[PDB]
Amino acid sequence: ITEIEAYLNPRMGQPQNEDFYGFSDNVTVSDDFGSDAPPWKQFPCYSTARISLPMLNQDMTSDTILMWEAISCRTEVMGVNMLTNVHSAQKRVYENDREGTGIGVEGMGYHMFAIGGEPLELQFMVFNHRATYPAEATVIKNPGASSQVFDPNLKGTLTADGVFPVEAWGPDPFKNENTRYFGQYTGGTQTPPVLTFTNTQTTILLDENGVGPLCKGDGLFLSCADIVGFFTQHNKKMSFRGLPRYFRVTLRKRVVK
Amino acid sequence: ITEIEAYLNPRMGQPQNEDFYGFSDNVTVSDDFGSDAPPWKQFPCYSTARISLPMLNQDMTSDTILMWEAISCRTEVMGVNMLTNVHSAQKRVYENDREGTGIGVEGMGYHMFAIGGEPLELQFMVFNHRATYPAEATVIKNPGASSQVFDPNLKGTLTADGVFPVEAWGPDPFKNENTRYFGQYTGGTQTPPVLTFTNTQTTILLDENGVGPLCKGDGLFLSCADIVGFFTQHNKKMSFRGLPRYFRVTLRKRVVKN
Amino acid sequence: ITEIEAYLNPRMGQPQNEDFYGFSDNVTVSDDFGSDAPPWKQFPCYSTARISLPMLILMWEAISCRTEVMGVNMLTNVHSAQKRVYENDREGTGIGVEGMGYHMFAIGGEPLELQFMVFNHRATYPAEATVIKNPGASSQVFDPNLKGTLTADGVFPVEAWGPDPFKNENTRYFGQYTGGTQTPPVLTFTNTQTTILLDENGVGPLCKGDGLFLSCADIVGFFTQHNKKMSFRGLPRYFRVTLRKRVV
Amino acid sequence: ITEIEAYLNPRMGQPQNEDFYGFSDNVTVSDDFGSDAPPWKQFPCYSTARISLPMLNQDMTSDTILMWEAISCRTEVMGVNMLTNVHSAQKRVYENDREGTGIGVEGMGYHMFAIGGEPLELQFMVFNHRATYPAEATVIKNPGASSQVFDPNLKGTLTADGVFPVEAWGPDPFKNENTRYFGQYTGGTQTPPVLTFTNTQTTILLDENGVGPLCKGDGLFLSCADIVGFFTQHNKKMSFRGLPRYFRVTLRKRVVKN
Amino acid sequence: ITEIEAYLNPRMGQPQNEDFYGFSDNVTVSDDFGSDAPPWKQFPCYSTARISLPMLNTILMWEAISCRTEVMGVNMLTNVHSAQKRVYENDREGTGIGVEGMGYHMFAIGGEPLELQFMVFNHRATYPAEATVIKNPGASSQVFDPNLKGTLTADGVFPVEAWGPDPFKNENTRYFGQYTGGTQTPPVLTFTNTQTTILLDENGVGPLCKGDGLFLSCADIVGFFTQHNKKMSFRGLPRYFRVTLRKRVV
Ligand SMILES: CC(=O)N[C@H]1[C@H]([C@H](O)[C@H](O)CO)O[C@@](OC[C@H]2O[C@@H](O)[C@H](O)[C@@H](O)[C@H]2O)(C(=O)O)C[C@@H]1O
Ligand SMILES: CC(=O)N[C@H]1[C@H]([C@H](O)[C@H](O)CO)O[C@@](O)(C(=O)O)C[C@@H]1O
Ligand SMILES: CC(=O)N[C@H]1[C@H]([C@H](O)[C@H](O)CO)O[C@@](O)(C(=O)O)C[C@@H]1O
Ligand SMILES: [Mg+2]
Ligand SMILES: [Mg+2]
Ligand SMILES: [Mg+2]
Ligand SMILES: [Mg+2]
Ligand SMILES: [Mg+2]
Ligand SMILES: [Mg+2]
């Protein structure tokens, strides 16, 4: 067996290597579905990376080939510790009284990861089809009313980091034969975040037939989104806060027909 | 072994191919049980479809027949990702300051799916028996006070998509020998929605005797309702929001004695 | 081996075959424990029925059951005469049913055995109800003298009686309570879940006199009118019980 | 095999056989930690009893002795039914409009039980070391700042009913090798109580070596605290409400190395 | 087997000698990320200890095969009389609100110091000289930066909000953590002497105690304490460890 370890940093909207890395810009809200254009930096996008596995040289001297098979993984949200910070420029519990701790991060949690032998296959689906996404984002333009629910025509693949809006794409259950994905959403803008972390939990990646994801072209595809909640400033402006995710994937060389 | 995949779009009330597909119209509330007539489009209805399976028999009456048996399934709520949208015309967290994110979708969750070899068998039951349903809806009319609890006379079958009100019909536990149904309700109007999604979870459909639903007339019947919660506008008008559901059903040919 | 199916309708307080069947009357609240008299119709009572089994030493043994709360679908109604989310602004959905959930069922070969226990011993219950009169301060906790049996539908107040753990050798009972008044109701329903009724010795309830005894209470929460008057709302319960003839 | 059944009534503060049995007196709150003196009756204490088991004759020349071994138990909180009362002199949901139900019992839940062959071994630990407990209570006087966290010298044993304050003593995990204890705390003052009751649940008391509590002196020791939450009067005064606990314990005679 | 029983007291910020041992000092909040300096005593730090095991020295090492751990003093949270903001504070009535808000509960058992990853909410925070941090860590420290490492080598000085367990390392330590956030959240805590956690990895091997040292680490933030004047402080509880060890030929 071979083990790989990798991380994905969150893509909440603000640029890397600058003071708000890990956050979105402050969120603005439209008055109407017909005048809805979320500016670049104000919404989270999916993280993804392709890991290069050791090259498996193919002979074609036999009727079978070798592929790396992902048999199990561990994954952890990292930096959960930082959410014990209730002093950094936060709206206070008694804000009208300039007293108490910061309220910290609260609101919606969206945590999903995927491990596969090819890019994650996506279904386009949006809350408001008339939202105009910015040029920086990868979306289906003029998607139509059908995109507010399931439309079999509206497909994509997660081929780039930090550009596919979380609010416009999710895993396609009609595909992803060669990917395992897991997700949880808890909504509501005052909801406390609930996160666990341990190095003792393994997730088996074998399907009903005892086969894990098979890494096409010796590539292992990792994808995630880890929205922890909102940061609220003293002036009540709110931004997404994300955390990075750790992956440990155990692979074996498998003979494939 | 044959596998089928299918979806059911939600039927929250607003019409298909129009700007509010996936939503109800804005909910209005009566003053009294005696003057309660929820307009068409303001309430959700059940989704359903019959999937045509490969024809097995020249004649459904034969001494012994082959039937498709649903032995297991996977089902997923799709589009959970869209609920990360807190910018689209939503009442804001600090609406008095015109500040903060949108409050997003909050309130009641009603999630139920059924997989069977015939239409889902329903029990009529309502909160207020004096509610007058619109002509578009399939209901028992003049159901009586009995209909606010269990009345063995008040039966139906889910034979049409988008017209059986969720608030008037539920699965009948006295029937559905040939259907498996699963339902979860969390109430409220500011409750956080909690949704999971994975392609790794299988539900076995075999009963206590090791037999799955048997598809009468080579039809597989899928039914659901997936109310995720309410959308609240700046003017405090509220509408149901629903999500579509994915089904994967594994079937095998079974020898059945008639 | 025989299967019976049965239902119990809730007994929340309002009479059958009238417009508020499934609800209590609007709840009134006393000023003091010493002037506390909950009027008839304003509080829930236990539901119970005896199912006659085929006449049969042989006894019917209940080996398993399924039970479901029916009509959960109705709680998606947020239009019927409900206080609104933004009631000041005359806007939003109704708040729907919210608050305490009390869900308990029992399956036995004899009437459910009860312990009398009340929040306030000085409450005067109405003539329609079955209670212990002048029960005394000891009734606010456990008093081994204060016993009863669930012998009638719709008259034993839920707030005055619960299952007696010192008895019920021949009954299985199961209960869950979540309190509050704004609590979100949580309910599940499936036809796929079986509860085994066999005890540690591999024996189910044995039906004395060829009678199967079903009992429940299913308070789902409160209905709140525009004028803020609040009433209990209940739901009916389905039972499927599997029985076998047993040599005793 | 021998079965014993017992109950412990709660010790929330107000005296037995008087109108507020099961409640505390109304809770007062100190202005600062230095001048903190919780009056007797305003706070709950642990319940405990020793059950006398049938006398076992000892062979005083034998390297083995006979002891009762507790192999399993059932325990139930009794009186959960009473919490459906929202009419008895409660602050109302809409107290401003003099309307709605009572708010009922809400706030913190503290549920713990212990079953052992000797008294429950306690660790003294308090929120505020400078609290002066009343003479009726059993505490460590002038315990010092270390008593706000763990201090190995602040030990006791639960040897009396209704006098060891819950807020000053908990089970000692460094001892209790001959006791099994289980506890759950949910805090808050508006939290809904969550309670279950069934006669079908057994807790095995055997340890990693297949040995249950061994009853020293043929005594079985039962302890609990069952704070269900607070009762709020119209005038906003708040008191603890407790419930009694049922125990069924299954014991066997065991020959033990001596 | 040999059994070790040990405790770790919390390090919420107030020193061991002071009347508010178990608490932080009252929390101040900055106006901006660029003017953010949490004063010493206002934030929790990790607890840690090294237990000396019997000298064993074919080389033998102590192997931690299982543990039990319990949060102690849960009983104290039933106190709603000690100078607390009241439920009806404007009416000066009701119980104290008691402890509410975030719970951060993590423990680690290992054969060497817990390996840490530095990560902060706001990289421009200036931590006090008493605290062990990476100074001027830069914007990358708001998410994962593989260069920002440490080891938990001292009790009471590594801020919880600046360090977490490093999943890239800790081959010889088991760690477990649960976080629920908020400031009004109801605390939920359980305690029993009946639950065992197995410390063996996939290969049937527990942590191996290097230099015959067993390393215990934790943080147990139970929530916030709120004064009548609305000043808020962290409250923590101590943790019990029982570790079962066997001699292993390595
Ligand atoms: C639970 C209880 O004790 N309910 C009382 C109820 C309450 O005391 C009342 O709702 C508190 O506001 O009052 C009942 O009497 C109402 C009646 O009381 C008369 O004495 C008074 O003269 C009238 O104005 C009127 O308020 C009631 O029926 O509502 C009795 C009930 O037992
Ligand atoms: C916990 C505590 O210290 N309670 C004390 C209270 C409070 O200080 C006041 O009620 C707050 O205003 O004051 C008393 O006079 C009282 O009311 O009986 C004495 C009591 O010891
Ligand atoms: C976290 C932080 O930066 N706290 C700082 C606070 C706050 O800015 C004010 O209390 C907010 O008004 O101010 C100080 O002067 C103080 O109180 O000692 C210095 C301290 O470093
Ligand atoms: Mg497919
Ligand atoms: Mg039937
Ligand atoms: Mg008995
Ligand atoms: Mg003692
Ligand atoms: Mg010990
Ligand atoms: Mg590593």
mmCIF file of C-alpha atoms and ligand atoms in Angstrom, chain A residues 5 246 248, chain E residues 167-171, ligand 9:
data_model
loop_
_atom_site.group_PDB
_atom_site.id
_atom_site.type_symbol
_atom_site.label_atom_id
_atom_site.label_comp_id
_atom_site.label_asym_id
_atom_site.label_seq_id
_atom_site.Cartn_x
_atom_site.Cartn_y
_atom_site.Cartn_z
ATOM 1 C CA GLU A 5 -1.290 13.234 2.498
ATOM 2 C CA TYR A 246 -6.543 17.426 5.487
ATOM 3 C CA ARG A 248 -4.798 10.952 3.965
ATOM 4 C CA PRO E 167 -2.834 15.735 11.200
ATOM 5 C CA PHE E 168 0.355 15.538 9.022
ATOM 6 C CA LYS E 169 2.281 14.258 12.087
ATOM 7 C CA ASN E 170 1.181 12.671 15.432
ATOM 8 C CA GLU E 171 1.956 9.083 14.237
HETATM 9 MG MG MG F 9 1.805 11.868 8.361
#
